[PDB]
C-alpha cells in the first residue's frame, strides 16, 4: 500500500495472508469459513503446490498472538481463460483444507449478487484496498497490514484520465480502475490478491481484487482491480463443486 | 391604445400602458429617449409565460423573460413539477430503499432480500444477522 | 446507441435543469450526479426527454461543485457534463420593484426579495438569505440624463426633484462573480 495507514488490529478481519514455503506471497479475501478469493497471477511462478498456506487473523508479521489461524491451501482454482504473465481474468478461488474459526478477528467479507454490485456497489465512490505490500514503488513491504481508501472510476474516465503507455495491457470489462493519478495513493504488487471492499448500508462487500497497474502510484495512472461482479456465478458454481484430485485446477469461464 | 382625438392629449404611462395596452410608438412617446423606451418595452411586451399554468401538482409559477420557474411542493420536482417522487420505487433508484438486495417486479412493487446469514425484517427492507459472525460486519465495532 | 453531447446547465435561482442532445432515437437516458467525493445518485430514470431537473439535489449544498453524466441505452455509453457550482454559476432571476415611497425630497425604492429554489425549514430561501453580503441590488433611474445607485439590502434611499416624475429599474448583482454577475433589468416603474 502506498500513501495509506495501518488497519487497526481487527478492522480488516477478512484480509488473508498467502504464503508459499513460509514466504510472503500475496493477499487474499475470506468470503466464508472455507473459501478464499485472491488473484490468479499470484500463482504464475509456483512450483511447490503442496506448500501454499493461508493465514487469517493476521496483523503484524513481526508478532504472534492467538488470533492467527493457518490452513493449507487444498486447491487453487483459476479461470481457464487466464494466461500466466498477463492481466485479464486475474482471479483465483482457493479452497482451504480445513475450515477456519470465525472470531472477532477473523470474519468473511460478503460476496454480493451480480446485479446488486453492478447497479449499486459500483457507484459507491469510495472502497478500501489493503495488504502487506510495498509502501513505495520498489520499496520494502509492510510489517503491519495497511489499508487505503480509493475512489472508483468507470473505464471510460480511467482511459481519458490516464497517460498512454504504448503496448500496455487493455482495461477490459473484467477490470476497473480505482485510485489517484497524482502519485500519492494506490495499492502495490505485494498487495496482489487483496480485497477492494465496498461499504454499503452497514455491510461490506467484495467488489475487487488488487490486480495490476503501471508501477505503483505513478503520476497519470490508477490502480486496476479485477471486477469481481463478473465472476459471481463462476465462484458460486465452484464452491458447490467437488474437490478435484490435484491442487491446481482450471475451470472454464464463462 | 388610441381613440378619436386622445392623441391631442400629452402622453401618460398610466392611461396608455397601465389602463390600456400601448404599442411601441405610444410607449416611445412617453419615454421619448430610445433606450428608456427599450428598457420598458422588453418587460412590457414579453408577456407572462405563467399564463398557461405550466407548473403542475400545486407548484408555483414565477414569471421571467420569455420563460418561467416552477416552485414545487415537497413531494415533486421537474421543470413543471411533473415528477412524482413517490413513483420512483425501482431498484436502480437508491437500491429501492433496500438495505441489501433489491429485485424489480414488472407491475407490482420491488421486493427486498438479504445475503446468507441474514433475514428480512418486518419492515421488508432491512436485514439483521442470523448467525454470530455474518459476512461484511466487523466485531470490534459492533 | 450514441453518447449524449452538448450537456448544458440551465439554472436560475437554483432552479437547475441539465439539458443535452440528441433527440432520442431508439434510446433512453439516465442521469447521475454527485459531488467530487460523494456517491453517484441516479436521476430521471430511463427518460426519453433530453433534460433532467436536479434542483432538489444541488440545493442540498449550493456551495458544492457537482458533476453529472448522461447514460445512453438502446458499462454503458455516457458523457460527462461541465462541473457546476450553484452559488457561483446559477443565474440571478429578473428582479421586481416592490414599491417606493416619497418623503419630501427623497424616495425609498424597495426591491421585492424574490424566492429561490433552496429549501430550508419547510420554506424557500430568498436570494438575500443565500448570498447574504455577496448580493447587492443596483438602481438605474432618471428624471422622467442617467443615474445609478447601489445597496447591500433590498432598498434604495435616493434624492429627487419635487414635481418631476421618476422611472426606476433594478438588477440583482454579485460583485465577486465574473460570469453571470448581474440579472436582467427589472420592469420599469414610475412614480
Ligand atoms: C513482459 C511484457 C510486459 O509488457 C508490459 C508493457 C507495459 C505495461 N504497462 C503496465 C503493465 C502491467 C504490469 N505493471 S508493471 O508495473 O509491471 C510494468 C509497467 C503489471 O502490473 N503486472 C502484474 C503481473 C502480471 C503477471 N501476470 O505476471 C502485476 O505486477 N500485478 C501486481 C500489481 C498489483 C497492484 C498494482 C497497482 N495497484 N499499481 C501494480 C501491480 C505492462 C506490461
Ligand atoms: C405556458 O407558457 C410557457 C411559455 O414558454 C410554455 O412553455 C408552457 O408550455 C405553457 O403551458
Ligand atoms: C407557490 O409555491 C408552491 C410551492 C405552493 O406553496 C403554492 O401553494 C404557492 O402558491
Ligand atoms: Ca502475527
Ligand atoms: Ca388611450
Ligand atoms: Ca395612445
Ligand atoms: Ca400618445
Ligand atoms: Ca381609456
Ligand atoms: Ca388608474
Ligand atoms: Ca408617432
Ligand atoms: Ca401617437
Ligand atoms: Ca415574461
Residue B50 CA to ligand 2 center (angstroms) comes to: 7
Q: Which residues of A are annotated as a binding site?
A: 186
Q: How far apart are CA C19 and CA C13, in angstroms?
A: 17
Q: How far apart are CA C184 and CA C188, in angstroms?
A: 12
CB B120 within 8 A of CB B131: no
Pick left, alpha or beta for residue C163 (phi over 0 → left; psi -120 to 50 → alpha; otherwise beta). left
CATH code: domain A13-108+230-243 is: 2.40.10.10
Of B63, B65, B43, B47, the closest CA to residue B55 belongs to B63
Any atom of ligand 2 within 6 Å of the Cβ of B52: yes
Q: Which residue bears the cell 422622467? A: C144
Structure solved via: X-ray
CB within 8 Å: C53 and B79: yes
Cα separation values, C150 from A22, B86, C144, C184, Å: 78, 45, 20, 16
Q: How far apart are CA A97 and CA C116, in angstroms?
A: 65
CATH code: domain A1-12+109-229 is: 2.40.10.10
State how beta strands A23-30 and A15-20 pair: antiparallel
Three cell numbers at C104? 419630501
Q: Do domains C1-89 and C90-191 have the same CATH topology?
A: yes
Number of domains in chain B: 1
Longest dimension (CA), chain B: 97
Query: H or E stretch including B34?
Result: helix B34-44
Which residue's CA is the closest to the ligand 2 atom numbered 8? B54
Distance (Å) from the alpha carbon of B101 to chain A's nearest alpha carbon? 6
Q: Do domains A1-12+109-229 and A13-108+230-243 have the same CATH topology?
A: yes
CB B72 within 8 A of CB B55: yes
Phi, psi of C9 (to 5 degrees): -100, 120
Please state the length of chain A: 254
Residue B28 CA to ligand 11 center (angstroms) comes to: 9
CB A178 within 8 A of CB A153: yes
Q: Helices (H) and strands (E) in chain A — how many of each?
A: 3, 14
CATH code: domain C90-191 is: 2.60.40.10
Residues 6+ apart with CB under 8 A from B56: B70, B76, B80, B81, B82
CB C30 within 8 A of CB C4: no
Cis peptide before A253, with omega less than 30 degrees from 0? no
A90 is catalytic: yes
The second-level CATH assignment, the architecture, of C1-89 is: Sandwich (2.60)
Domain boundaries, chain A: 1-12+109-229, 13-108+230-243
Three cell numbers at C83? 462541473
CB C178 within 8 A of CB C164: no
Asked, for residue B1, whether it belongs to a domain, the answer is no
Instruction: Give the number of other Cβ atoms within 10 Å of residue A52's Cβ.
Output: 24
Q: How far apart are CA C177 and CA C188, in angstroms?
A: 25
C34 contacts on A by Cβ (under 8 Å): 125
Q: How far apart are CA B97 and CA B89, in angstroms?
A: 8
Q: How far apart are CA A72 and CA A167, in angstroms?
A: 38
What b-and-e string marks burial along C54-67, b requiring 16 or more CB atoms within 10 Å of the CB?
bbbbbbeebebebb
Q: How far apart are CA C165 and CA C162, in angstroms?
A: 8
Of A170, A139, A191, the closest CA to residue A15 belongs to A191
Query: What residues are in contact with ligand 1 under a 6 Å CB criterion?
Result: A 41, 44, 85-87, 165, 167-169, 186-189, 192, 210-216, 223
Name the residue range of residue B70's domain: 12-142
Any atom of ligand 3 within 6 Å of the Cβ of B59: yes
A192 is catalytic: yes
Q: How far apart are CA C71 and CA C79, in angstroms?
A: 7
Residue C119 in 3-state DSSP? strand
Three cell numbers at A244? 478435484
CB A16 within 8 A of CB A38: yes
CB A94 within 8 A of CB A235: no
State how beta strands C51-53 and B83-84 pair: unpaired
User: Would you give the distance in Å from CA A127 to the centre of its chain?
Assistant: 13
A111 contacts on B by Cβ (under 8 Å): 135
Residue C86 in 3-state DSSP? helix
Asked, for residue B98, whether it belongs to a domain, the answer is yes
Residues 6+ apart with CB under 8 A from B32: none
Residue A118 in 3-state DSSP? helix
Give DSSP secondary structure letters for C64-119: S-EEEEEEEE---EEEEPPPB-HHHHSBPPPP-EEEEEE-SSEEEEEE---EEEEE
Asked, for residue B111, whether it belongs to a domain, the answer is yes
Residue B123 at interface with chain A, using a CB cutoff of 8 Å: no
Apex C7 CA angle, C6 and C10, nearest 5 = 120
CB B96 within 8 A of CB B110: yes
Any atom of ligand 2 within 6 Å of the Cβ of B79: no
Distance (Å) from the alpha carbon of C188 to chain B's nearest alpha carbon? 5
Q: Which residues of A are annotated as a binding site for substrate?
A: 186
Of A100, A125, A104, A122, the closest CA to residue A113 belongs to A122
Cis peptide before B130, with omega less than 30 degrees from 0? no
Amino acid at each position: 500500500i502506498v500513501g495509506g495507514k495501518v488497519c487497526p488490529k481487527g478492522e480488516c478481519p477478512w484480509q488473508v495472508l498467502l504464503l508459499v514455503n513460509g514466504a510472503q506471497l500475496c493477499g487474499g479475501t475470506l468470503i466464508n469459513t472455507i473459501w478464499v478469493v485472491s488473484a490468479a497471477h499470484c500463482f504464475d511462478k509456483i512450483k511447490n503446490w503442496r506448500n501454499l498456506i493461508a493465514v487469517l487473523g493476521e496483523h503484524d508479521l513481526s508478532e504472534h498472538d492467538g488470533d492467527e489461524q493457518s490452513r493449507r491451501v487444498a486447491q487453487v482454482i483459476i479461470p481457464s481463460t487466464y494466461v500466466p504473465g498477463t492481466t485479464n481474468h486475474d482471479i483465483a478461488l482457493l479452497r482451504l483444507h480445513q475450515p477456519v474459526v470465525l472470531t472477532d478477528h477473523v470474519v468473511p467479507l460478503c460476496l454480493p449478487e451480480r446485479t446488486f454490485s453492478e447497479r449499486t456497489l459500483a457507484f459507491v465512490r469510495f472502497s478500501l484496498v489493503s495488504g502487506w505490500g510495498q509502501l513505495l514503488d520498489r520499496g520494502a513491504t509492510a510489517l503491519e497490514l495497511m489499508v487505503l481508501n480509493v475512489p472508483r472510476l468507470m473505464t471510460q474516465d480511467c482511459l481519458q484520465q490516464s497517460r498512454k503507455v504504448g503496448d500496455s495491457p487493455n482495461i477490459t470489462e473484467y477490470m476497473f480502475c480505482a485510485g489517484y493519478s497524482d502519485g500519492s495513493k494506490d495499492s502495490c504488487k505485494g498487495d496482489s490478491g487483496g480485497p477492494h471492499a465496498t461499504h454499503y448500508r452497514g455491510t461490506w462487500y467484495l467488489t475487487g481484487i488488487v490486480s495490476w497497474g503501471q508501477g505503483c502510484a505513478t503520476v497519470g495512472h490508477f490502480g486496476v482491480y479485477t471486477r469481481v461482479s463478473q465472476y459471481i456465478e463462476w465462484l458460486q458454481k465452484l464452491m458447490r463443486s467437488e474437490p478435484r484430485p490435484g491442487v491446481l485446477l482450471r475451470a472454464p469461464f464463462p | 391604445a388610441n381613440a378619436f382625438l386622445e392623441e391631442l392629449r400629452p402622453g401618460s404611462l398610466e392611461r396608455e400602458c397601465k389602463e390600456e395596452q400601448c404599442s411601441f410608438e405610444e410607449a416611445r412617446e412617453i419615454f421619448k429617449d430610445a433606450e428608456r423606451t427599450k428598457l420598458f418595452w422588453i418587460s412590457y411586451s414579453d408577456g407572462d409565460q405563467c399564463a398557461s399554468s405550466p407548473c403542475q401538482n400545486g407548484g408555483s409559477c414565477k414569471d421571467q423573460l420569455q420563460s418561467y420557474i416552477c416552485f414545487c411542493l415537497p413531494a415533486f420536482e421537474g421543470r413543471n413539477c411533473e415528477t412524482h417522487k413517490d413513483d420512483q420505487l425501482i431498484c436502480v433508484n437508491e437500491n429501492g430503499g433496500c438495505e441489501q438486495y433489491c429485485s424489480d417486479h414488472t407491475g407490482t412493487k420491488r421486493s427486498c432480500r438479504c445475503h446468507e446469514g441474514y433475514s428480512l425484517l418486518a419492515d421488508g427492507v432491512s436485514c439483521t444477522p442470523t448467525v454470530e459472525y455474518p459476512c461484511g460486519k466487523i466485531p470490534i465495532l459492533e | 446507441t450514441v453518447a449524449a453531447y452538448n450537456l448544458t446547465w440551465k439554472s436560475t435561482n437554483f432552479k437547475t435543469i441539465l439539458e443535452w442532445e440528441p433527440k432520442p432515437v431508439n434510446q433512453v437516458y439516465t442521469v447521475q450526479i454527485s459531488t467530487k467525493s460523494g456517491d453517484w445518485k441516479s436521476k430521471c430514470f430511463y427518460t426519453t426527454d433530453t433534460e433532467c431537473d436536479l434542483t432538489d439535489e444541488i440545493v442540498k449544498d449550493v456551495k458544492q461543485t457537482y458533476l453529472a453524466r448522461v447514460f445512453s441505452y438502446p458499462e454503458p455509453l455516457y458523457e460527462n457534463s461541465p462541473e457546476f457550482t450553484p452559488y457561483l454559476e446559477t443565474n440571478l432571476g429578473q428582479p421586481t420593484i416592490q414599491s417606493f415611497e416619497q418623503v419630501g425630497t427623497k424616495v425609498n425604492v424597495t426591491v421585492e426579495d424574490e424566492r429561490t429554489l433552496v429549501r430550508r425549514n419547510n420554506t424557500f430561501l430568498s436570494l438575500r438569505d443565500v448570498f447574504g453580503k455577496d448580493l447587492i441590488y443596483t438602481l438605474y433611474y432618471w428624471k422622467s440624463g442617467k443615474k445609478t445607485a447601489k445597496t447591500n439590502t433590498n432598498e434604495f434611499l435616493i434624492d429627487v426633484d419635487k414635481g418631476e416624475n421618476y422611472c426606476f429599474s433594478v438588477q440583482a448583482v454579485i460583485p465577486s462573480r465574473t460570469v453571470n454577475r448581474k440579472s436582467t433589468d427589472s420592469p420599469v416603474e414610475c412614480m
